[PDB]
A paper describes a structure:
To define the role of RdrA in phage defense, we used cryo-EM to determine a 2.5 Å structure of E. coli RdrA. In contrast to most closed-ring AAA+ proteins that form hexameric assemblies, RdrA is an atypical complex with 7 repeating subunits. The second RdrA insertion occurs after the sensor 1 motif and includes three helices between strands β4 and β5 that reach into the central channel of the heptamer. In contrast to the N-terminal AAA+ domain, the α-helical RdrA C terminus contains no detectable homology with other known structures. RdrA is an active ATPase in vitro that preferentially hydrolyzes ATP.
The RADAR system comprises two genes, rdrA that encodes a protein with an ATPase domain, and rdrB, encoding a predicted adenosine deaminase domain protein. Here, we determine cryo-EM structures of the RADAR defense complex, revealing RdrA as a heptameric, two-layered AAA+ ATPase and RdrB as a dodecameric, hollow complex with twelve surface-exposed deaminase active sites. Our results define ATP mononucleotide deamination as a determinant of RADAR immunity and reveal supramolecular assembly of a nucleotide-modifying machine as a mechanism of anti-phage defense.
Author numbering:
A (entry chain G): 35 to 50, 69 to 76, 81 to 94, 102 to 140, 147 to 183, 190 to 395, 412 to 519, 524 to 661, ...
B (entry chain A): 35 to 50, 69 to 76, 81 to 94, 102 to 140, 147 to 183, 190 to 395, 412 to 474
C (entry chain F): 475 to 519, 524 to 661, 704 to 897, 910 to 934
The structure:
């Protein structure tokens, strides 16, 4: 290094305190300096205070090393020697002073025989150093002390020896370590001087405060004394030795990934990390991958070495799942960090039940609860920042090649954090706050979910015990349907009945049914439970019979309690059996990231509240038939909640899915479909004909959206009766919205003769339009003009 | 195992820190490796830190085992010997350093007679290892340390000896255990360095917080140092050695239920558990029985061994109530767990009055209160 | 702590040196992360409880881990919006809470706020200040902080034009956030921001601010902000729109003076506490803030304007930060909005003579006379904020006599 040239060269003209300190490799740099010195300066062999005999003063080790150097010189090529012996023996017999339990008078006679008076070990050692300098043909002898991170008690002996014995011209001291450690040592030793019973007696806040300021002053002066500021050495870090974002990179160093790597194929060093991160996190080349790489370059240099070496050696292994490799390397390297945070230790239950609970725990200690599920490395501390990248690798590996597990991550993990913020934080002390979390976990089943629909059923209760402002049954992503026909209706408004709905429309509709058993056993039609249903029929199996009971689990009336803090489906099954196979072949080619999954949720969750407000205040008596943009009903709200999902997946997946290098969505102003399908009709489309000029399909690129848009479960909600706008203007999108959907799915969704009834019935919802919503007074009519 | 081939074979081309760590049977795998090594590498007999004399440094045991190996070789088929003795005696007389209550000046004269200067035990032991390697016709001597689950204090002496003495080419170290235990040991030792009255004085939340982050950094660096990540060994678990749901099952092993079992009628291993579970829980072949079996396959391998053996031996007994047999085996095997949870200890009041109260207690600590009476194995914890 | 103060002052001086984005960062995240806590979060808070309230205030504010300046300003809207009282108007510290539901019986032409009727840069400038807070009603705030946060986010993107494009889309897009846990059509505007960003890029490097300057710019700005939050609060009449006069105020006049409060605060302190010039060009005078008129702003620019010439200096070499801020296309639509311009015989003599001084600094002439004439009885000028109703605003009495 040029910095080691620094240290040598300033030491060289520093003799023509005298202690040089190096922050922080420390050991490698210290050894480099020792060498560069071999204009003469002697250098003692580097002393490691953590490896010395325990009860052995540093003066003993320094004197022994000096004795060996002096005697090795004295040997080659007697008058000088016995007068080196003289000082060695007298320093020895003067060395009881450092070790004794007490003074005994026999030591007075030792102090009266004869340049200052007495047996002061400082003087004797300084003459010993004068001896050594005369003998060795050197002026100054470099006593160099090695880092003490292992056991920093020995640092105190080092500091005291530097202060009392190595203070002399013939000695130049190079110490290294971390100045917080020496701060700690000195502060503790300064507190040691205060008398006992004084400390137990004066315990007012003022006394502790002034003694703190005071140990301040003493420790600070001690450190400015032993380690002069002008003599302190950089020892930069890695990120400083490489480029920041391409605008830097002084003295790049390169790492070697493969055995052959003939000193030319070395793929950089920033690269090796970027490539591990992008492969094992599934992150694309966006600013987020350079993000993770920047944080990981700031690591202790050994940690980066070990993680980057384990990853690539086991990768050579694999080629005679990259996220599995990166996850293993991160688990081992950041093992103490994750074991701190209380995350799952075991490998034998990595799975994803423990993954969601790990994310919840991380978010709990990272606080946040809003962007925490992103798992970005932004935290206060090194420990949680390491845990963030480790959990990102966990997500990338576990969710890879599975549409069910993707929806799982999305719902259980991220929702388990979002739902808690907006609907459970209004209650919560720290003892009380964690216990509220403890039940929120226990009730939510976070860490031990049976099924995604079970979580969504419990999510309905949590969401449904807080909202206000006229007490409508239009909650975040759901509608609370009336189940008692005791209310005087205008027009054709009436109950909800599952029997009037048929085939797939019934099956799609019944999946979203949710019953909560607080006291009234209501029924919610919720988008989450529909998403939970999709997750549950995404990884059942190749069977048709297994899909059958998979339906019966989500189809059946699912009933659950509020938390402790408030034949006829024959063709639809073949179709789900259809789409499941479609998912099965081609879900394996999906590598999502905590970024994509978190951002898909962010759009989806945001789009959800715009629907919960714009369509809230549009429930008129004649708002049914939903023919227009300013008329809304229970069918339009749900359709746009489903469309909010699909749009959220389409957008972020066009942005943050590592299956394609680039976006097909374009540089545009990006909105969500709330009251119309302007934005959705759009992005599909602009992507639609770009795919052709790029010679790509919805398969190879945008897999997750393709599988979701092709789900028979979703289709009835897409174009429900009374959820389709019927304006001359509005139709030009919606008819042209239909074509694009058919072209992606591969089968044409509704017949014209089914399309005509919509805009002027199996696989289409026809009974939700006129289903009354709680709190919706339905007494007013739509505005004119 | 192919994994033991792993450990041997990477050790083989690891000499052409240097410490290999194995998670976790640990003892059986360690012994297998010691053997597979017998291209020469010497291997010391496996050291169990929990069975050594108490106050005895690991260096003493390592040096004694090396002395026996070297002298057993030196005996068959003198110039070399007294110069092995030389280093043994000088290492000895340099061994007061590890044990002394304090330093006494008489030890200075011991440090001034004569390649670095002094009586540093590291150097003397490294020359002792050079001695042994020259004598034994080997390059590196495998110091292999056994698991410490019984009493993990001795792990600290092991770690310090690895750091200060076994750091040398002529030595390759294979340690095993659970890295949480060593994390604990190192963190406690790091907290030991903070001065007393400092700890009793600075007790703001910020001070504890930063000292926690700090003992973090130190403990983590210590472990990345002594146990390099690239050198850490799998030691999978049972469920990984068998099928998940029929879509896996690499190197199935089989268990034997009956005395005769002529190595062909042995009814699998996943089966034996599935059949105990289905008989003693009355569960049918639904996903719930495969459930219970999956959880029980993830157990410490000894626990599964003992429960599965008690059940079937007492079953042979019964045929010259299966749920009674499985219940007895589970009570004995999971005895510490149930005694933790406060459930009924006694057998003489199993009955069902205590059963309902046991379920209520379990549900209380499992929280839940909604699916808890299902008694499915879904909880936070192993217990 | 006295030593820590000088150390942190050095940190501020080094980090904010040669960067207009980082200057706005310091100003907003650091200083605002303190004032906002005082006036809107201290009313809740024991020491154990007090620190934990701080801990979330940090965590929610993103202090120490902000992504973007606009993100902080979005979160600042929620914090400011869960305390005020006294007739419950949507005229908060530096913001206006606009009605988003057209369910209220209006006098005159009062109606909603719509982003679609605003065009080009006026839309882009207007949409940057949009802020949605998702407690239970998902309101929409037009806030000066988010506009300042927007400027910070398009000050250090890069030389690209495409990077500016998505930089817009991040701040332009509806930004929605939660209350704390304690309660094609923009084509030419982009070239212009691309314009002004280059202008910033060449000459922001010559800006060395201090914790004193940044703190004092905030002090004036923060103070000027509450005078606007009170003087213009009690002037929302039914015919107060068109803002033709000094005692008539609307949603456009409040915002214009909030923007003018910023620019005046920067101009004054930077004439006093910027180490690029040895001396002040502002003069030894009695120093006020433009609250209900531009007497004071028209003034100081000007007295500095012709001193610069006798001193042979320009707005470039001296007063860089104000020059870059006043030349920002994002700010210009708020400077002379429809219904925010006083139209009295007396009041115009400043405002017409206020316009000239601005053009002469920026280097391009801001509004055509034929755009100026319509103002004093449309792209790059806000024309829809005047008649946008404010929550709580009575809007029943029109300029109550005496």
């Amino acid at each position: 290094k040029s910095l080691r040239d620094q240290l040598v060269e300033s030491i060289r003209n520093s003799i023509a305190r005298n202690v040089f300190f190096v922050d922080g490799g420390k050991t490698t740099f210290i050894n480099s300096v020792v060498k560069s010195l071999n204009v003469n300066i002697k250098c003692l062999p580097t002393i490691d205070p953590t490896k010395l005999p325990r009860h052995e003063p540093i003066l003993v080790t320094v004197t022994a090393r000096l004795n060996k150097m002096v005697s090795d010189k004295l040997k080659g090529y007697r008058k000088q020697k016995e007068q080196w012996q003289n000082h060695l023996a007298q320093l020895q017999r003067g060395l009881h002073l450092l070790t004794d339990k007490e003074y005994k008078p026999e030591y007075f006679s030792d102090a009266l025989k004869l340049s200052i008076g007495g047996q002061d070990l400082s003087e004797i050692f300084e003459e010993l150093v004068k001896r050594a300098c005369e003998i060795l043909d050197c002026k100054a002898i470099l006593i160099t002390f090695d880092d003490i991170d292992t056991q920093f008690d020995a640092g105190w002996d080092v500091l005291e020896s530097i202060r009392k014995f190595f203070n002399s011209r013939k000695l130049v001291v190079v110490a290294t370590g971390d100045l917080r450690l020496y701060s700690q040592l000195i502060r503790g030793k300064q507190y040691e001087n205060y008398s006992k019973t004084l400390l137990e007696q004066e315990k007012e806040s003022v006394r502790l405060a002034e003694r703190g300021y005071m140990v301040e002053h003493l420790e600070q002066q001690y450190l400015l004394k032993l380690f002069p500021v002008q003599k302190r050495i950089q020892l930069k870090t890695m990120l400083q030795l490489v480029g920041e974002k391409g605008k830097a990179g002084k003295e790049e160093i390169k790492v070697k990934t493969e055995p052959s790597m003939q000193d030319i194929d070395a793929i950089d060093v920033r690269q090796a990390i970027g490539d591990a991160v992008r492969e094992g996190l599934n992150l694309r080349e966006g600013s987020d991958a350079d993000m993770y790489v920047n944080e990981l370059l700031k690591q202790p240099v050994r940690l980066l070495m070990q993680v980057l070496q384990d990853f690539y050696t086991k990768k050579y292994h694999a080629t005679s799942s990259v996220p599995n490799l990166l996850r293993n390397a991160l688990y081992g390297s950041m093992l103490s960090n994750i074991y701190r945070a209380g995350l799952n230790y075991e490998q034998h239950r990595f799975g994803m039940d423990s993954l969601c609970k790990d994310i919840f725990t991380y978010v709990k200690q990272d606080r946040d609860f809003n962007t925490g599920f992103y798992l970005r490395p932004q935290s206060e501390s090194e420990a949680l920042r390491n845990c963030s990248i480790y959990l990102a690798s966990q997500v990338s590996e576990n969710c890879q090649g599975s549409l069910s597990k993707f929806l799982q991550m999305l719902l259980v993990g991220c929702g388990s954090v979002s739902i808690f913020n907006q609907f459970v934080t209004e209650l919560a002390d720290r003892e009380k706050f964690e216990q509220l979390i403890s039940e929120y976990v226990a009730y939510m089943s976070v860490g031990r979910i049976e099924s995604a629909s079970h979580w969504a059923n419990r999510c309905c209760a949590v969401v449904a015990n807080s909202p206000n402002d006229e007490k409508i049954g239009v909650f975040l992503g759901m509608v609370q349907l009336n189940r008692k026909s005791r209310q005087n209706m205008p027009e054709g408004y009436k109950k909800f009945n599952i029997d009037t709905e048929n085939g797939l429309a019934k099956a799609a509709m019944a999946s979203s049914l949710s019953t909560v058993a607080s006291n009234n056993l209501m029924d919610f039609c919720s988008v989450f439970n529909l998403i939970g249903a999709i997750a549950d029929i995404s990884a059942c199996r190749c069977e048709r019979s297994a899909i059958t009971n998979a339906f019966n689990k989500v189809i059946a009336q699912t009933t659950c309690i509020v938390p402790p803090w408030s034949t006829e489906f024959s063709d639809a099954i073949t179709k789900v059996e259809q789409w499941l196979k479609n998912v099965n072949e081609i879900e394996i080619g999906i590598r999502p990231s905590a970024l994509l999954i978190g951002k898909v949720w962010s759009r989806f969750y945001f789009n959800l509240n715009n629907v919960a407000d714009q369509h809230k205040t549009r429930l008129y008596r004649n708002a049914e038939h939903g023919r227009m943009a300013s008329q809304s009903n229970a069918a339009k709200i749900m359709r746009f909640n489903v469309l909010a999902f699909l749009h959220a997946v389409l957008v972020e997946e066009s942005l943050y899915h590592s299956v394609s290098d680039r976006e097909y969505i374009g540089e545009g102003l990006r909105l969500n479909p709330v009251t119309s399908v302007d934005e959705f009709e759009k992005k599909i489309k602009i992507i639609g004909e770009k795919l052709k000029a790029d010679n790509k399909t919805w398969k190879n690129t945008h897999p997750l959206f393709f599988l979701l848009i092709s789900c028979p479960i979703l289709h009835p909600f897409i174009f429900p009766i009374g959820g389709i706008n019927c304006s001359v203007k509005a139709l030009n999108k919606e008819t042209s919205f239909n074509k694009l959907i058919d072209e992606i799915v591969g089968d044409k969704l509704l017949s014209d003769e089914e399309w005509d009834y919509l805009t002027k019935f199996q696989n289409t919802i026809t009974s939700l339009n006129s289903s009354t919503i709680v709190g919706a007074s339905y007494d007013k009519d739509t505005p004119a003009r």
